[PDB]
Design a protein around this ligand. Structure first.
Ligand SMILES: *[C@@H]1O[C@H](CO)[C@@H](O[C@@H]2O[C@H](CO)[C@@H](O[C@@H]3O[C@H](CO)[C@@H](O)[C@H](O)[C@@H]3O)[C@H](O)[C@H]2NC(C)=O)[C@H](O[C@@H]2O[C@@H](C)[C@@H](O)[C@@H](O)[C@@H]2O)[C@H]1NC(C)=O
Ligand SMILES: *[C@@H]1O[C@H](CO)[C@@H](O)[C@H](O[C@@H]2O[C@@H](C)[C@@H](O)[C@@H](O)[C@@H]2O)[C@H]1NC(C)=O
Length: 206
């Protein structure tokens, strides 16, 4: 959680990772409702997210622009991107320390508010069209790397922007968001061959 030249604190990085992994674990344990009021299906092989300084560096470069939008495609090759902003009429400095976790709650909130019952867990065109792509990237079983950048100087210090980058990039159409199964109990349950038993998520390093 130490990233040379970074503008985040170690704690911010940890809070972001711990929150997103908690979400993932709650999800694969069947504890989270979709828009229809029905629990999402239990999952297996959901990777445990690791912080990547490389990802933070690209996300931070974009956050520094103070633009509420995506970075250009050619700077996002192989990489997912989620964008969050908070617009105040006063200073946002007090919001910096929870920027990442507020952003994760906002992206993640797509599940209960916009994500209709999808039993196959397949990311079809009709599922994608709902605007659940921020949530689906945070939930993407194959993604295992996350890095985020934050700007609080935007609009005279009155706008907060948080940018998170994910690798590998999630949201490939016609692939499942995550595999249907049981959370890992032992290493051999995981295709990566290492299981985080407390969370039921599979470990994948870097
Ligand atoms: C997610 O859901 C989509 C929509 O059903 C799956 O794609 C569909 O796969 C079917 C076969 O599993 C395709 O059927 C074929 O249709 C052609 C058209 O003539 C026939 O010639 C052929 O013999 C089959 O009957 C179906 O067309 C296809 N849907 C579309 C519009 O693409 C998808 O399955 C996955 O993607 C497809 C493209 C293949 O790679 C499948 O093997 C693969 O499982 C579902 N995704 C997942 C991960 O389940
Ligand atoms: C989730 O809620 C929506 C809106 O209330 C319903 O349309 C879904 O049931 C639907 O059943 C038919 C009409 C068809 O639209 C189907 O695609 C939907 O599933 C409901 N989902 C379920 C599975 O009950």
């Amino acid at each position: 959680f130490e990233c040379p030249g970074g503008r985040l604190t170690p704690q911010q990085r940890k809070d972001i990772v711990r929150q997103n992994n908690k979400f993932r674990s709650l999800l694969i344990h069947g504890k989270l409702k979709n828009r229809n009021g029905t629990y999402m299906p239990r999952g297996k092989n959901m990777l445990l997210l690791k912080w990547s300084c490389q990802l933070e560096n690209s996300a931070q470069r974009w956050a520094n622009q103070c633009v509420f939008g995506h970075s250009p495609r050619n700077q996002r090759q192989g990489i997912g991107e989620n964008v969050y902003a908070y617009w105040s009429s006063e200073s946002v400095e007090k919001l910096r320390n929870t920027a990442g976790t507020e952003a994760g709650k906002s992206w993640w909130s797509e599940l209960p508010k916009l994500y209709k019952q999808n039993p196959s867990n397949n990311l079809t065109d009709d599922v994608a069209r709902q605007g659940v792509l921020h949530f689906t990237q945070m939930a993407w079983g194959k993604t295992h790397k996350i890095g985020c950048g934050i700007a609080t100087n935007c609009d005279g210090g009155r706008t907060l922007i948080a940018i998170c980058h994910y690798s590998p990039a999630g949201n490939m159409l016609k692939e499942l968001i995550y595999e249907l199964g049981e959370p890992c109990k032992t290493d051999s349950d995981c295709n990566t061959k290492k299981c985080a038993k407390k969370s039921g998520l599979c470990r994948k390093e870097l």
